[PDB]
Amino acid sequence: FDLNDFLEQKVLVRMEAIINSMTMKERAKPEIIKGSRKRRIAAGSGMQVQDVNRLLKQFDDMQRMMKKM
RNA sequence: GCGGGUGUUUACCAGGUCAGGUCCGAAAGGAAGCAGCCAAGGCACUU
């Protein structure tokens, strides 16, 4: 379960836009997303880095909920 | 070696285009621009 499936699953428009600025590798291996990438992304989707982190924050909790059944 | 071709590779770090999202604007319209793609470079092979 990567950022892709989570993509298929109105704050949504923004959560989609953020993921839509990532590369295929970033959507598949979310951990490789550190500072520099975050800035590229944040700016790429007209967002604030803090927002991106929120997005990553959610997907993480969402991820865990998966790895429990 | 020069040129051509082919496979593959490359988040951002002044190439082009720019979905989605963003900014300015009441609006009409403007601005920037990630991913993709194209191009370009790399690693090889080839002619």
Short mmCIF file of all heavy atoms in Angstrom, two decimals, chain B residues 16-38:
data_model
loop_
_atom_site.label_atom_id
_atom_site.label_comp_id
_atom_site.label_asym_id
_atom_site.label_seq_id
_atom_site.Cartn_x
_atom_site.Cartn_y
_atom_site.Cartn_z
P G B 16 12.72 27.54 -20.93
OP1 G B 16 12.43 28.95 -21.33
OP2 G B 16 12.48 27.11 -19.53
"O5'" G B 16 11.91 26.58 -21.91
"C5'" G B 16 11.80 26.87 -23.29
"C4'" G B 16 10.85 25.90 -23.96
"O4'" G B 16 11.38 24.56 -23.78
"C3'" G B 16 9.46 25.81 -23.36
"O3'" G B 16 8.60 26.84 -23.84
"C2'" G B 16 9.01 24.43 -23.84
"O2'" G B 16 8.64 24.43 -25.21
"C1'" G B 16 10.30 23.63 -23.68
N9 G B 16 10.41 22.94 -22.39
C8 G B 16 11.16 23.31 -21.30
N7 G B 16 11.06 22.47 -20.30
C5 G B 16 10.19 21.49 -20.76
C6 G B 16 9.70 20.32 -20.13
O6 G B 16 9.97 19.89 -19.00
N1 G B 16 8.81 19.62 -20.94
C2 G B 16 8.45 19.99 -22.21
N2 G B 16 7.57 19.19 -22.84
N3 G B 16 8.92 21.07 -22.83
C4 G B 16 9.77 21.77 -22.05
P U B 17 7.33 27.29 -22.94
OP1 U B 17 6.67 28.43 -23.62
OP2 U B 17 7.78 27.44 -21.53
"O5'" U B 17 6.35 26.04 -23.01
"C5'" U B 17 5.85 25.57 -24.25
"C4'" U B 17 5.09 24.28 -24.05
"O4'" U B 17 6.02 23.23 -23.65
"C3'" U B 17 4.08 24.30 -22.92
"O3'" U B 17 2.85 24.87 -23.35
"C2'" U B 17 3.93 22.82 -22.61
"O2'" U B 17 3.12 22.17 -23.57
"C1'" U B 17 5.37 22.35 -22.74
N1 U B 17 6.08 22.40 -21.46
C2 U B 17 5.90 21.33 -20.59
O2 U B 17 5.22 20.36 -20.87
N3 U B 17 6.56 21.44 -19.39
C4 U B 17 7.37 22.49 -18.98
O4 U B 17 7.89 22.45 -17.86
C5 U B 17 7.52 23.55 -19.94
C6 U B 17 6.89 23.47 -21.12
P C B 18 2.03 25.83 -22.37
OP1 C B 18 0.82 26.25 -23.11
OP2 C B 18 2.97 26.86 -21.85
"O5'" C B 18 1.60 24.88 -21.16
"C5'" C B 18 0.86 23.70 -21.42
"C4'" C B 18 0.98 22.73 -20.28
"O4'" C B 18 2.38 22.53 -19.96
"C3'" C B 18 0.38 23.13 -18.94
"O3'" C B 18 -1.02 22.83 -18.96
"C2'" C B 18 1.11 22.22 -17.96
"O2'" C B 18 0.53 20.94 -17.88
"C1'" C B 18 2.49 22.09 -18.62
N1 C B 18 3.56 22.85 -17.96
C2 C B 18 4.16 22.31 -16.82
O2 C B 18 3.74 21.23 -16.39
N3 C B 18 5.17 22.98 -16.22
C4 C B 18 5.58 24.15 -16.72
N4 C B 18 6.58 24.77 -16.10
C5 C B 18 4.98 24.73 -17.88
C6 C B 18 3.98 24.05 -18.46
P A B 19 -1.91 23.09 -17.65
OP1 A B 19 -3.08 23.92 -18.06
OP2 A B 19 -1.01 23.59 -16.56
"O5'" A B 19 -2.45 21.63 -17.27
"C5'" A B 19 -3.20 20.87 -18.21
"C4'" A B 19 -3.58 19.52 -17.63
"O4'" A B 19 -2.40 18.71 -17.42
"C3'" A B 19 -4.24 19.54 -16.26
"O3'" A B 19 -5.63 19.83 -16.37
"C2'" A B 19 -4.01 18.12 -15.78
"O2'" A B 19 -4.94 17.20 -16.32
"C1'" A B 19 -2.61 17.82 -16.32
N9 A B 19 -1.56 18.04 -15.33
C8 A B 19 -0.68 19.09 -15.26
N7 A B 19 0.13 19.05 -14.23
C5 A B 19 -0.23 17.88 -13.58
C6 A B 19 0.27 17.26 -12.41
N6 A B 19 1.26 17.76 -11.67
N1 A B 19 -0.30 16.09 -12.03
C2 A B 19 -1.29 15.59 -12.78
N3 A B 19 -1.83 16.08 -13.89
C4 A B 19 -1.26 17.24 -14.24
P G B 20 -6.30 20.88 -15.36
OP1 G B 20 -7.77 20.79 -15.51
OP2 G B 20 -5.61 22.19 -15.54
"O5'" G B 20 -5.95 20.31 -13.92
"C5'" G B 20 -6.58 19.14 -13.43
"C4'" G B 20 -5.90 18.69 -12.17
"O4'" G B 20 -4.50 18.39 -12.48
"C3'" G B 20 -5.79 19.73 -11.07
"O3'" G B 20 -6.98 19.80 -10.30
"C2'" G B 20 -4.63 19.17 -10.25
"O2'" G B 20 -5.01 18.07 -9.44
"C1'" G B 20 -3.69 18.70 -11.36
N9 G B 20 -2.73 19.73 -11.73
C8 G B 20 -2.70 20.50 -12.88
N7 G B 20 -1.71 21.37 -12.88
C5 G B 20 -1.05 21.15 -11.68
C6 G B 20 0.09 21.76 -11.14
O6 G B 20 0.80 22.63 -11.64
N1 G B 20 0.41 21.23 -9.89
C2 G B 20 -0.28 20.22 -9.26
N2 G B 20 0.16 19.84 -8.05
N3 G B 20 -1.33 19.64 -9.76
C4 G B 20 -1.67 20.14 -10.96
P G B 21 -7.60 21.24 -9.92
OP1 G B 21 -8.85 20.98 -9.17
OP2 G B 21 -7.64 22.09 -11.15
"O5'" G B 21 -6.55 21.89 -8.92
"C5'" G B 21 -6.45 21.45 -7.58
"C4'" G B 21 -5.16 21.94 -6.95
"O4'" G B 21 -4.04 21.53 -7.79
"C3'" G B 21 -4.96 23.43 -6.83
"O3'" G B 21 -5.62 23.96 -5.69
"C2'" G B 21 -3.45 23.51 -6.65
"O2'" G B 21 -3.05 23.09 -5.36
"C1'" G B 21 -2.99 22.48 -7.68
N9 G B 21 -2.82 23.12 -8.97
C8 G B 21 -3.65 23.01 -10.06
N7 G B 21 -3.27 23.74 -11.07
C5 G B 21 -2.10 24.36 -10.62
C6 G B 21 -1.23 25.27 -11.28
O6 G B 21 -1.31 25.74 -12.42
N1 G B 21 -0.18 25.65 -10.46
C2 G B 21 0.03 25.20 -9.19
N2 G B 21 1.13 25.69 -8.58
N3 G B 21 -0.77 24.34 -8.57
C4 G B 21 -1.81 23.97 -9.34
P U B 22 -6.12 25.49 -5.69
OP1 U B 22 -6.89 25.71 -4.44
OP2 U B 22 -6.77 25.74 -7.01
"O5'" U B 22 -4.79 26.35 -5.63
"C5'" U B 22 -3.81 26.11 -4.62
"C4'" U B 22 -2.59 26.96 -4.85
"O4'" U B 22 -1.94 26.59 -6.10
"C3'" U B 22 -2.85 28.45 -5.03
"O3'" U B 22 -2.99 29.06 -3.75
"C2'" U B 22 -1.58 28.92 -5.73
"O2'" U B 22 -0.52 29.10 -4.82
"C1'" U B 22 -1.27 27.72 -6.63
N1 U B 22 -1.72 27.94 -8.01
C2 U B 22 -0.96 28.78 -8.80
O2 U B 22 0.05 29.32 -8.39
N3 U B 22 -1.43 28.96 -10.08
C4 U B 22 -2.56 28.40 -10.63
O4 U B 22 -2.85 28.64 -11.80
C5 U B 22 -3.29 27.54 -9.75
C6 U B 22 -2.85 27.34 -8.50
P C B 23 -3.88 30.39 -3.59
OP1 C B 23 -3.94 30.66 -2.14
OP2 C B 23 -5.12 30.21 -4.37
"O5'" C B 23 -2.99 31.53 -4.27
"C5'" C B 23 -1.78 31.95 -3.67
"C4'" C B 23 -1.04 32.89 -4.58
"O4'" C B 23 -0.74 32.23 -5.83
"C3'" C B 23 -1.81 34.12 -5.01
"O3'" C B 23 -1.79 35.11 -4.00
"C2'" C B 23 -1.06 34.54 -6.26
"O2'" C B 23 0.14 35.24 -5.98
"C1'" C B 23 -0.74 33.18 -6.89
N1 C B 23 -1.73 32.75 -7.89
C2 C B 23 -1.70 33.33 -9.16
O2 C B 23 -0.87 34.22 -9.40
N3 C B 23 -2.58 32.90 -10.10
C4 C B 23 -3.46 31.93 -9.80
N4 C B 23 -4.29 31.50 -10.75
C5 C B 23 -3.51 31.34 -8.50
C6 C B 23 -2.65 31.78 -7.59
P C B 24 -3.12 35.94 -3.69
OP1 C B 24 -2.90 36.71 -2.44
OP2 C B 24 -4.28 35.01 -3.78
"O5'" C B 24 -3.19 36.96 -4.91
"C5'" C B 24 -2.13 37.88 -5.11
"C4'" C B 24 -2.34 38.65 -6.39
"O4'" C B 24 -2.13 37.79 -7.53
"C3'" C B 24 -3.75 39.16 -6.64
"O3'" C B 24 -4.05 40.31 -5.86
"C2'" C B 24 -3.68 39.48 -8.12
"O2'" C B 24 -2.93 40.65 -8.36
"C1'" C B 24 -2.90 38.27 -8.63
N1 C B 24 -3.77 37.18 -9.11
C2 C B 24 -4.37 37.33 -10.36
O2 C B 24 -4.16 38.36 -11.01
N3 C B 24 -5.17 36.34 -10.83
C4 C B 24 -5.37 35.25 -10.10
N4 C B 24 -6.15 34.30 -10.62
C5 C B 24 -4.77 35.07 -8.82
C6 C B 24 -3.98 36.06 -8.36
P G B 25 -5.51 40.46 -5.20
OP1 G B 25 -5.46 41.74 -4.45
OP2 G B 25 -5.91 39.21 -4.51
"O5'" G B 25 -6.46 40.62 -6.46
"C5'" G B 25 -6.47 41.84 -7.19
"C4'" G B 25 -7.34 41.72 -8.41
"O4'" G B 25 -6.78 40.76 -9.33
"C3'" G B 25 -8.75 41.23 -8.19
"O3'" G B 25 -9.60 42.27 -7.74
"C2'" G B 25 -9.13 40.81 -9.60
"O2'" G B 25 -9.42 41.93 -10.41
"C1'" G B 25 -7.83 40.14 -10.05
N9 G B 25 -7.86 38.73 -9.68
C8 G B 25 -7.32 38.16 -8.55
N7 G B 25 -7.60 36.90 -8.44
C5 G B 25 -8.36 36.62 -9.56
C6 G B 25 -8.98 35.42 -9.96
O6 G B 25 -9.00 34.34 -9.36
N1 G B 25 -9.63 35.56 -11.18
C2 G B 25 -9.68 36.72 -11.92
N2 G B 25 -10.31 36.65 -13.10
N3 G B 25 -9.14 37.86 -11.53
C4 G B 25 -8.50 37.73 -10.35
P A B 26 -10.61 42.00 -6.53
OP1 A B 26 -11.50 43.18 -6.39
OP2 A B 26 -9.74 41.59 -5.40
"O5'" A B 26 -11.49 40.77 -7.02
"C5'" A B 26 -12.47 40.17 -6.17
"C4'" A B 26 -13.80 40.06 -6.89
"O4'" A B 26 -14.33 41.40 -7.09
"C3'" A B 26 -13.74 39.47 -8.29
"O3'" A B 26 -13.80 38.04 -8.27
"C2'" A B 26 -14.97 40.07 -8.96
"O2'" A B 26 -16.18 39.42 -8.63
"C1'" A B 26 -14.98 41.47 -8.35
N9 A B 26 -14.32 42.51 -9.14
C8 A B 26 -13.24 43.28 -8.78
N7 A B 26 -12.92 44.20 -9.66
C5 A B 26 -13.84 44.01 -10.68
C6 A B 26 -14.05 44.68 -11.89
N6 A B 26 -13.32 45.73 -12.30
N1 A B 26 -15.04 44.24 -12.70
C2 A B 26 -15.78 43.20 -12.29
N3 A B 26 -15.69 42.49 -11.16
C4 A B 26 -14.69 42.96 -10.39
P A B 27 -12.70 37.19 -9.10
OP1 A B 27 -12.74 35.79 -8.63
OP2 A B 27 -11.42 37.95 -9.04
"O5'" A B 27 -13.23 37.21 -10.61
"C5'" A B 27 -14.60 36.99 -10.90
"C4'" A B 27 -15.00 37.78 -12.13
"O4'" A B 27 -14.82 39.20 -11.89
"C3'" A B 27 -14.20 37.51 -13.38
"O3'" A B 27 -14.73 36.37 -14.03
"C2'" A B 27 -14.45 38.77 -14.20
"O2'" A B 27 -15.70 38.72 -14.87
"C1'" A B 27 -14.55 39.85 -13.12
N9 A B 27 -13.39 40.72 -12.95
C8 A B 27 -12.40 40.64 -12.00
N7 A B 27 -11.53 41.62 -12.05
C5 A B 27 -11.97 42.40 -13.11
C6 A B 27 -11.49 43.61 -13.67
N6 A B 27 -10.43 44.27 -13.20
N1 A B 27 -12.15 44.12 -14.73
C2 A B 27 -13.21 43.46 -15.19
N3 A B 27 -13.77 42.33 -14.75
C4 A B 27 -13.09 41.84 -13.69
P A B 28 -13.79 35.49 -14.99
OP1 A B 28 -14.61 34.36 -15.51
OP2 A B 28 -12.52 35.19 -14.27
"O5'" A B 28 -13.48 36.45 -16.22
"C5'" A B 28 -14.50 36.84 -17.12
"C4'" A B 28 -13.97 37.88 -18.07
"O4'" A B 28 -13.71 39.11 -17.35
"C3'" A B 28 -12.64 37.51 -18.71
"O3'" A B 28 -12.87 36.73 -19.88
"C2'" A B 28 -12.06 38.88 -19.04
"O2'" A B 28 -12.61 39.42 -20.23
"C1'" A B 28 -12.52 39.71 -17.84
N9 A B 28 -11.56 39.77 -16.73
C8 A B 28 -11.35 38.80 -15.79
N7 A B 28 -10.45 39.12 -14.89
C5 A B 28 -10.04 40.39 -15.27
C6 A B 28 -9.12 41.29 -14.71
N6 A B 28 -8.42 41.04 -13.60
N1 A B 28 -8.94 42.48 -15.33
C2 A B 28 -9.66 42.73 -16.44
N3 A B 28 -10.57 41.97 -17.05
C4 A B 28 -10.71 40.80 -16.41
P G B 29 -11.69 35.82 -20.48
OP1 G B 29 -12.10 35.30 -21.81
OP2 G B 29 -11.20 34.87 -19.44
"O5'" G B 29 -10.53 36.86 -20.73
"C5'" G B 29 -9.20 36.47 -20.58
"C4'" G B 29 -8.41 37.59 -19.97
"O4'" G B 29 -8.97 37.97 -18.69
"C3'" G B 29 -7.00 37.17 -19.65
"O3'" G B 29 -6.25 37.22 -20.83
"C2'" G B 29 -6.62 38.19 -18.59
"O2'" G B 29 -6.35 39.44 -19.17
"C1'" G B 29 -7.92 38.26 -17.79
N9 G B 29 -7.97 37.26 -16.72
C8 G B 29 -8.74 36.13 -16.69
N7 G B 29 -8.58 35.43 -15.59
C5 G B 29 -7.64 36.15 -14.86
C6 G B 29 -7.06 35.88 -13.60
O6 G B 29 -7.27 34.92 -12.84
N1 G B 29 -6.15 36.86 -13.23
C2 G B 29 -5.84 37.97 -13.99
N2 G B 29 -4.94 38.82 -13.46
N3 G B 29 -6.37 38.23 -15.17
C4 G B 29 -7.25 37.28 -15.54
P G B 30 -4.92 36.35 -20.95
OP1 G B 30 -4.59 36.21 -22.40
OP2 G B 30 -5.09 35.13 -20.11
"O5'" G B 30 -3.85 37.28 -20.26
"C5'" G B 30 -2.79 36.74 -19.52
"C4'" G B 30 -2.40 37.68 -18.42
"O4'" G B 30 -3.51 37.85 -17.49
"C3'" G B 30 -1.29 37.11 -17.58
"O3'" G B 30 -0.05 37.38 -18.22
"C2'" G B 30 -1.50 37.80 -16.25
"O2'" G B 30 -1.03 39.13 -16.24
"C1'" G B 30 -3.02 37.77 -16.16
N9 G B 30 -3.51 36.51 -15.60
C8 G B 30 -4.41 35.66 -16.19
N7 G B 30 -4.65 34.59 -15.47
C5 G B 30 -3.86 34.75 -14.34
C6 G B 30 -3.69 33.90 -13.22
O6 G B 30 -4.23 32.81 -12.99
N1 G B 30 -2.80 34.44 -12.31
C2 G B 30 -2.15 35.63 -12.45
N2 G B 30 -1.32 35.98 -11.45
N3 G B 30 -2.29 36.43 -13.50
C4 G B 30 -3.16 35.93 -14.40
P A B 31 0.93 36.16 -18.55
OP1 A B 31 1.97 36.64 -19.48
OP2 A B 31 0.08 35.01 -18.93
"O5'" A B 31 1.60 35.89 -17.13
"C5'" A B 31 2.24 36.96 -16.44
"C4'" A B 31 2.74 36.50 -15.10
"O4'" A B 31 1.63 36.35 -14.18
"C3'" A B 31 3.41 35.14 -15.09
"O3'" A B 31 4.75 35.22 -15.57
"C2'" A B 31 3.30 34.77 -13.62
"O2'" A B 31 4.20 35.48 -12.79
"C1'" A B 31 1.87 35.25 -13.33
N9 A B 31 0.89 34.23 -13.65
C8 A B 31 0.12 34.15 -14.78
N7 A B 31 -0.69 33.12 -14.81
C5 A B 31 -0.42 32.46 -13.62
C6 A B 31 -0.95 31.29 -13.05
N6 A B 31 -1.87 30.54 -13.65
N1 A B 31 -0.48 30.92 -11.84
C2 A B 31 0.46 31.67 -11.25
N3 A B 31 1.03 32.79 -11.69
C4 A B 31 0.54 33.14 -12.89
P A B 32 5.39 33.95 -16.32
OP1 A B 32 6.63 34.39 -17.00
OP2 A B 32 4.32 33.29 -17.11
"O5'" A B 32 5.76 32.97 -15.11
"C5'" A B 32 6.62 33.42 -14.07
"C4'" A B 32 6.46 32.57 -12.84
"O4'" A B 32 5.07 32.58 -12.41
"C3'" A B 32 6.74 31.09 -12.98
"O3'" A B 32 8.13 30.82 -12.92
"C2'" A B 32 6.06 30.54 -11.74
"O2'" A B 32 6.82 30.76 -10.57
"C1'" A B 32 4.78 31.38 -11.70
N9 A B 32 3.70 30.69 -12.39
C8 A B 32 3.20 30.89 -13.66
N7 A B 32 2.24 30.07 -13.99
C5 A B 32 2.08 29.27 -12.86
C6 A B 32 1.21 28.21 -12.57
N6 A B 32 0.30 27.75 -13.43
N1 A B 32 1.32 27.63 -11.35
C2 A B 32 2.23 28.10 -10.49
N3 A B 32 3.10 29.10 -10.65
C4 A B 32 2.97 29.65 -11.87
P G B 33 8.75 29.71 -13.89
OP1 G B 33 10.21 29.66 -13.59
OP2 G B 33 8.28 29.98 -15.27
"O5'" G B 33 8.09 28.33 -13.42
"C5'" G B 33 8.34 27.82 -12.13
"C4'" G B 33 7.28 26.81 -11.75
"O4'" G B 33 5.98 27.40 -12.00
"C3'" G B 33 7.23 25.52 -12.54
"O3'" G B 33 8.13 24.59 -11.95
"C2'" G B 33 5.81 25.05 -12.25
"O2'" G B 33 5.73 24.50 -10.95
"C1'" G B 33 5.05 26.37 -12.30
N9 G B 33 4.46 26.65 -13.60
C8 G B 33 4.91 27.54 -14.54
N7 G B 33 4.16 27.57 -15.61
C5 G B 33 3.17 26.63 -15.35
C6 G B 33 2.08 26.22 -16.15
O6 G B 33 1.77 26.61 -17.28
N1 G B 33 1.32 25.25 -15.50
C2 G B 33 1.57 24.75 -14.25
N2 G B 33 0.70 23.83 -13.77
N3 G B 33 2.60 25.12 -13.51
C4 G B 33 3.34 26.06 -14.12
P C B 34 8.75 23.40 -12.84
OP1 C B 34 10.22 23.61 -12.76
OP2 C B 34 8.07 23.34 -14.16
"O5'" C B 34 8.36 22.10 -12.00
"C5'" C B 34 8.79 21.97 -10.66
"C4'" C B 34 7.93 20.98 -9.92
"O4'" C B 34 6.58 21.47 -9.80
"C3'" C B 34 7.75 19.62 -10.57
"O3'" C B 34 8.86 18.78 -10.32
"C2'" C B 34 6.52 19.10 -9.84
"O2'" C B 34 6.88 18.63 -8.56
"C1'" C B 34 5.68 20.38 -9.74
N1 C B 34 4.75 20.51 -10.87
C2 C B 34 3.60 19.71 -10.89
O2 C B 34 3.39 18.93 -9.94
N3 C B 34 2.76 19.81 -11.94
C4 C B 34 3.03 20.66 -12.93
N4 C B 34 2.19 20.71 -13.95
C5 C B 34 4.18 21.49 -12.92
C6 C B 34 5.00 21.38 -11.88
P A B 35 9.39 17.83 -11.48
OP1 A B 35 10.57 17.11 -10.97
OP2 A B 35 9.51 18.66 -12.71
"O5'" A B 35 8.21 16.78 -11.63
"C5'" A B 35 7.83 15.97 -10.53
"C4'" A B 35 6.61 15.15 -10.88
"O4'" A B 35 5.43 16.00 -10.93
"C3'" A B 35 6.64 14.51 -12.25
"O3'" A B 35 7.40 13.31 -12.25
"C2'" A B 35 5.16 14.25 -12.51
"O2'" A B 35 4.71 13.12 -11.81
"C1'" A B 35 4.54 15.51 -11.92
N9 A B 35 4.39 16.54 -12.95
C8 A B 35 5.14 17.68 -13.13
N7 A B 35 4.77 18.39 -14.17
C5 A B 35 3.70 17.69 -14.69
C6 A B 35 2.86 17.92 -15.79
N6 A B 35 2.99 18.97 -16.60
N1 A B 35 1.87 17.03 -16.05
C2 A B 35 1.75 15.97 -15.23
N3 A B 35 2.48 15.64 -14.15
C4 A B 35 3.44 16.55 -13.94
P G B 36 8.18 12.87 -13.58
OP1 G B 36 8.69 11.50 -13.32
OP2 G B 36 9.11 13.95 -13.99
"O5'" G B 36 7.04 12.78 -14.69
"C5'" G B 36 6.01 11.81 -14.59
"C4'" G B 36 5.06 11.92 -15.75
"O4'" G B 36 4.32 13.17 -15.67
"C3'" G B 36 5.73 11.95 -17.11
"O3'" G B 36 5.93 10.61 -17.54
"C2'" G B 36 4.70 12.68 -17.96
"O2'" G B 36 3.64 11.82 -18.32
"C1'" G B 36 4.17 13.72 -16.96
N9 G B 36 4.88 14.99 -16.98
C8 G B 36 5.86 15.40 -16.10
N7 G B 36 6.32 16.59 -16.36
C5 G B 36 5.60 16.99 -17.47
C6 G B 36 5.66 18.20 -18.20
O6 G B 36 6.39 19.18 -17.99
N1 G B 36 4.76 18.21 -19.25
C2 G B 36 3.91 17.17 -19.57
N2 G B 36 3.11 17.36 -20.64
N3 G B 36 3.85 16.04 -18.90
C4 G B 36 4.72 16.02 -17.87
P C B 37 7.18 10.24 -18.48
OP1 C B 37 6.97 8.84 -18.91
OP2 C B 37 8.43 10.60 -17.76
"O5'" C B 37 6.99 11.18 -19.74
"C5'" C B 37 5.91 10.97 -20.62
"C4'" C B 37 5.80 12.09 -21.61
"O4'" C B 37 5.48 13.32 -20.91
"C3'" C B 37 7.06 12.42 -22.37
"O3'" C B 37 7.23 11.51 -23.46
"C2'" C B 37 6.78 13.86 -22.82
"O2'" C B 37 5.90 13.96 -23.93
"C1'" C B 37 6.05 14.42 -21.60
N1 C B 37 6.93 15.15 -20.67
C2 C B 37 7.23 16.51 -20.92
O2 C B 37 6.74 17.07 -21.91
N3 C B 37 8.05 17.17 -20.06
C4 C B 37 8.55 16.53 -18.99
N4 C B 37 9.36 17.21 -18.16
C5 C B 37 8.26 15.16 -18.73
C6 C B 37 7.46 14.51 -19.58
P C B 38 8.70 11.15 -23.99
OP1 C B 38 8.57 10.07 -25.00
OP2 C B 38 9.60 10.95 -22.83
"O5'" C B 38 9.17 12.47 -24.74
"C5'" C B 38 8.46 12.95 -25.87
"C4'" C B 38 8.88 14.37 -26.18
"O4'" C B 38 8.53 15.24 -25.07
"C3'" C B 38 10.37 14.59 -26.34
"O3'" C B 38 10.81 14.19 -27.63
"C2'" C B 38 10.45 16.10 -26.16
"O2'" C B 38 9.96 16.77 -27.30
"C1'" C B 38 9.46 16.32 -25.01
N1 C B 38 10.09 16.31 -23.68
C2 C B 38 10.86 17.44 -23.28
O2 C B 38 10.96 18.41 -24.06
N3 C B 38 11.45 17.44 -22.06
C4 C B 38 11.32 16.38 -21.25
N4 C B 38 11.93 16.42 -20.06
C5 C B 38 10.55 15.23 -21.63
C6 C B 38 9.96 15.24 -22.83
#
